[PDB]
């Protein structure tokens, strides 16, 4: 079960495979983009326009495509923005290469050209960069928001998405420190409840997890009581109560004395264990198993809410901000072995009776977990993806104040620059540098084709104004506004992101054009 | 059967040559090989290609044998031994059809390899301290081999990671295992960092670390083959209970037993505790209270080198530890390279090894300069091991081919045809060096023949400018024993292929 | 039918080399003979190269070229007809290898013309006139 | 589905072009054609290829019409009009795959041709009707590919001066049917006889009685075979030819027997009428035309108004040639008839040699039709590509994108010339463009030099008509094929 094909004709097989990958992802590019139906292994129906999930759930058997996907993962992991453009641009770069192959251009002569042409394009893009953070700090916050809405207004939340941008820009403002000059995106957890509306999503200044207090007589809010070590959370596997197995018992009872004798044992272990909560230093107790009712009533006098059947990772997320520990026994617990917060309160959301638990530090917290609602279970999944992506939108805008005015205008601006350097080639490479422009044009072309605009005249419309007039942003009208000028529409992409799109795509040309054999061995 | 078995055997050898044909050279092409483990590799390394080649034809299994041995016997030449050996088979097709017996063919190849290696011996130039040293010679060779790469702008950083990395190795016992290579995602090529020690993952799914001293001026390393944990952050384990009152007592008792092991380690006094198995939360905070380093996920490749670095060893027992199991370096510190946790030892004076930590934009982007450093390490390795230098880049195959033609001018008889083919076959190396590089093979080969015939024995293939030039002056230097053992290896390989007249198959 | 490229070039070689198998053995006073048979059953065996080719039934269109060129050698000079086919088939067989090495057919033809242009000069050097018969008669050994 | 119809029309025509692609150039590859009549032919003549292709594909039979039109228009380079058509169709396939409707495509090719002809008019090397230096220069270089081109230097004034006499200086049309080339065995290649009148392939009466010549000769054409099923009947037939005093008689070659029974031939001798036999149908169209006479099919319809007039009628028998020349027609309705007798060694040599001169006659006509010489070696195709690419940069809209693809298609001629010459295709066209960045006519693909140089300096120029009609007629084919919407049978 191996392949046999000799000559450059094998590269025609390889490129024709890439055209299949593109025919999938192509139609997903743009805010007017078309969705894909994803058949889950279990039959679950997922509908998304996100090329990261489209490529992740895309299953193809040609190993050339498996390379294209594995390499595109680096766009999602390092940057997290335009994985879609990596595949779309690469396909066009390979499509123009197919023409170069037939013209007799040696495979390496092709690769050397795309490398030097990228050195021209990225440089000419830098000549047009702009500083989104210029002037005042309040202007930074303003423009930071104006762009964040461009990523959120493209999803189902677009009706009132400004509210998801409210939590996003304010979150990264809380999570970003200009002295640190970096944003640890793991400091933000994405979590919501199934059902609700856009206005039911909240900006939460602290940790919220899918839990509620296990006993209604315990206080829904615990405070340090003016000066204590905040609110400590007990993270244990066993409850504070007389020991009772959760599998089998097998306690032989020989007489009535022995029968009720366990209740005597329970009374001392009831008060001992609930005193061991207070002595151990827990203000609330969360254990993998629940707590005895009589212990629960003895906990009441000390205001010791508790929660049952909770996994370690969920309490870990709290323990990250509170510096808690999973101590094997309650006897070695301390004010520090049990992590500390300032306030734990249980919040009800209108008709939502879930009443989730929120852990705050009564100050600027080291972590936030924002609250997401949406009218359909699957809307919530994508809505949190919008917060994930818009979190990376502002994360890159913090990383690099340099931005480009996008919408295909930067690609056409770079395309025109490549055509300017075409006349300066006057050599064999002139064949290849020109094709780089023909490939750069496929991004604004794809943007127009997914929008319902003229696939050819749109290219001449953008090139006309970006050539005869000025480098002023002349974008694609996919948003349905009046005309071009994304500076007026405040549609902006990160500079470092577009640089990575061009450079990573060039790497894909180095990877695909330099594979001459596909040897697929069997398995024993 | 008969001579037709040779014809079929030759056709099998052609398959191997054509497969490895594009792999030759720094400008060469990669092969995508899907393994039975579903792991797929894309590599230009002939050894990687060989390990996964999956040859089933008994005749071509011979070519794998001589090539796999070329790797361990010499250390380089896994591609050239398959190219040269294959062309010596391709040149044999017309000679077999004309009825030249296999002894007549093989005898001449055995006479030719003797006549050829003699001239490889004549060409060798002795370069150890010859008007050069570490900083000059190794840079002239490393800067050349690392040219025409994604580091074209950043060579000084990879020359630092190349020449000073290998020159700082133990030269009395010099081997590739002395430099480890670890892929660090994130960063830039001009910012990629090298370390004197070895690195570790320390990426546990449990958070709450780093609030623990990770740095010691005089660490004391204790390595265990067992885990140090009780309560796991993710899964759990069955704990057996004897009584409803002892259901929670065994949990307390489980604290006692692991606390006891951690207590005996607490007294042991190791400032660094390494383990091959995961470390739990009880030990996480416990050793934080002890203010010593402890981490699992340590490999033997990292750990056995730690033993050389600090002078410890592995002892799982908590009470039976002999002082010789603990050692100390000049500095230990967990490194945050590239905004990612990679624990390492820093500046161990007893360490005979080091590690290049590779930073870059993407994992594949690193891989491009990764195998480049892999080769660069070998570039210096041979610069020190082999004082006898022959001109690389095809110049040797030019020099030999001329002497072979003169032997065919003087030697008359049935040996004349065989000698000439042995020479014609040596042009497959410069031919594939040109076709894999993108040059005009007919133009370059004809200019190589005319230029060499003018008396210049150092002419060779220049990859920077499509031209023929003095590769000796370009410091494109290759070991003599590599070319000698490769040429002897190929001749024996052709003696194995040409000498088979029957294949006997036991089926069942 | 449309046959072009590597196919028609390989078919032309199979034809020319096949024709050579009919002339290969006819060269020399120690030659081996070949016999030709028609439908009515007449048979003839000859070592004469002009007869071997003159009676040869060639159907492949590339061989019809080899015969037309060979017959002209006989009509014009009357000898050297055996060398025509043998030389030609080795020229084409080795030419096929040149084609597979990415040498354009025009380049091959141009250079083959150059070699002939030089060859006549080397013939002028090695040849001798009607001599070696006066003072010593090497035609004695011819006799 | 009209997209399937167009797909088939494009694929089919491309396969015809890929067949001729190898034939362009003096180093061109030969095509073998096995015909249904049982003859296998091998030739590099392009019209021969498509003529004997016997194309059955209804769409590809338009490509034959393209070839014949190029031959009747200019008469040279008819290989290139098919190659140009092929590239424009291959580029059209790219345009069709881009989703541009054929109507937009065709009209854009129309506008490209309008600009393309103007580009050729710019680079025109000026000629003149009196410029016999350049006329002899170019004509003999068009004969340079022939068997003996050294003797073609003397064949040059044959073609040049003979056409300059038949054609007025200020004239837009020359008729190549009015210049008849006739072969004759004997003589040398430089030996030809150019006659300012009609030339008869036969002589006077075959048997004794031939007058061989006439003064004040009136030429009639009676074509019908005269033989007995007789004396008075066969004699009276030819008597009336004497009645109107007709002194020269032309008789069409008959499929029954020889022209006329000897009774009426010797009677025509007794009538003193010069008898010319075995005249061909096309000869009558040539001969009766220049003479200003009307042919008569039968022997009964002889009349007086159809009498001719010839100043000189004599038998030209040189070393046993036996061909008659008639000069001094002086007919009000006639045209300057020119006929040439081609002397030479072998009958087969003079037959092909005549055809080599027909090629040359087309060259001079092309220069009279439209003045100018254009660089050979595909140089005008590289120059046009650069100019239309430059103009497509300022042109806006889908019309610009199609203009750009037109420029890509213009490379098929310099590319084909380079491939059949055995030079690296990209190397050559790269060098061609670099040279056109400095020079204009200073460029061209040279077979002798194996590189780029000035075909003017290499004495390789082609009539501007050849290039102008090549682009013009090609745009007509592109329109015709792209406009094919469906194929239906009629019965």
Swiss-Prot record, chain A:
InterPro entries named among the record's database cross-references: Chap_CCT_epsi (IPR012718), Chaperone_TCP-1 (IPR017998), Chaperonin_TCP-1_CS (IPR002194), Cpn60/GroEL/TCP-1 (IPR002423), GroEL-like_apical_dom_sf (IPR027409), GROEL-like_equatorial_sf (IPR027413), TCP-1-like_intermed_sf (IPR027410), TCP-1_chaperonin (IPR053374)
Transmembrane segments: none
Keywords tagged on the record: ATP-binding, Chaperone, Cytoplasm, Nucleotide-binding
Cell location: Cytoplasm
Pfam family name, one: Cpn60_TCP1
Cellular-component GO terms for this entry: chaperonin-containing T-complex
Domain of life according to the entry: Eukaryota
GO MF terms held by the record: ATP binding; ATP hydrolysis activity; ATP-dependent protein folding chaperone; unfolded protein binding
ATP-binding as UniProt keyword: yes
Annotated GO biological process: chaperone mediated protein folding independent of cofactor; protein folding
Function summary: Molecular chaperone; assists the folding of proteins upon ATP hydrolysis. Known to play a role, in vitro, in the folding of actin and tubulin. In yeast may play a role in mitotic spindle formation.
Binding partners and assembly: Heterooligomeric complex of about 850 to 900 kDa that forms two stacked rings, 12 to 16 nm in diameter.
Family of this protein: Belongs to the TCP-1 chaperonin family.
Record-given protein name: T-complex protein 1 subunit epsilon
From Swiss-Prot, chain B:
TM region(s), chain numbering: none
Keyword Chaperone found: yes
Gene3D superfamilies xrefs: GroEL (3.50.7.10), GroEL-like equatorial domain (1.10.560.10), TCP-1-like chaperonin intermediate domain (3.30.260.10)
Protein localization: Cytoplasm
Keywords, alphabetical: ATP-binding, Chaperone, Cytoplasm, Nucleotide-binding
Keyword Metal-binding included in the entry's annotation: no
Pfam families per the UniProt record, alphabetical: Cpn60_TCP1
GO molecular function, one term: unfolded protein binding
Listed GO biological process terms: chaperone mediated protein folding independent of cofactor; protein folding
Family classification: Belongs to the TCP-1 chaperonin family.
Subunit description: Heterooligomeric complex of about 850 to 900 kDa that forms two stacked rings, 12 to 16 nm in diameter.
Job of this protein: Molecular chaperone; assists the folding of proteins upon ATP hydrolysis. Known to play a role, in vitro, in the folding of actin and tubulin. In yeast may play a role in mitotic spindle formation.
Protein name, per record: T-complex protein 1 subunit eta
Annotated gene: CCT7
From Swiss-Prot, chain C:
Signal peptide range in chain numbering: none
This protein's name: T-complex protein 1 subunit alpha
Location of this fragment in the whole protein: 18 to 160 of 559
Impact noted for substituting residue 31 to E: Temperature-sensitive
Localization: Cytoplasm
Quaternary structure annotation from Swiss-Prot or TrEMBL: Heterooligomeric complex of about 850 to 900 kDa that forms two stacked rings, 12 to 16 nm in diameter.
Organism: Saccharomyces cerevisiae (strain ATCC 204508 / S288c)
Family, as annotated: Belongs to the TCP-1 chaperonin family.
Role, per record: Molecular chaperone; assists the folding of proteins upon ATP hydrolysis. Known to play a role, in vitro, in the folding of actin and tubulin. In yeast may play a role in mitotic spindle formation.
From Swiss-Prot, chain D:
UniProt signal peptide: none
Subcellular location: Cytoplasm
Keywords: ATP-binding, Chaperone, Cytoplasm, Nucleotide-binding
Gene3D superfamilies: GroEL, GroEL-like equatorial domain, TCP-1-like chaperonin intermediate domain
Entry-linked PROSITE patterns: TCP1_1 (PS00750), TCP1_2 (PS00751), TCP1_3 (PS00995)
Pfam families noted in UniProt: Cpn60_TCP1 (PF00118)
One GO cellular component term noted in the UniProt record for this chain: chaperonin-containing T-complex
GO molecular function: ATP binding; ATP hydrolysis activity; ATP-dependent protein folding chaperone; unfolded protein binding
GO biological-process terms attached to the record: chaperone mediated protein folding independent of cofactor; protein folding
Its job: Molecular chaperone; assists the folding of proteins upon ATP hydrolysis. Known to play a role, in vitro, in the folding of actin and tubulin. In yeast may play a role in mitotic spindle formation.
Other comment: Present with 5530 molecules/cell in log phase SD medium.
UniProt record similarity statement: Belongs to the TCP-1 chaperonin family.
Record note on quaternary structure: Heterooligomeric complex of about 850 to 900 kDa that forms two stacked rings, 12 to 16 nm in diameter.
Name recorded for this polypeptide: T-complex protein 1 subunit delta
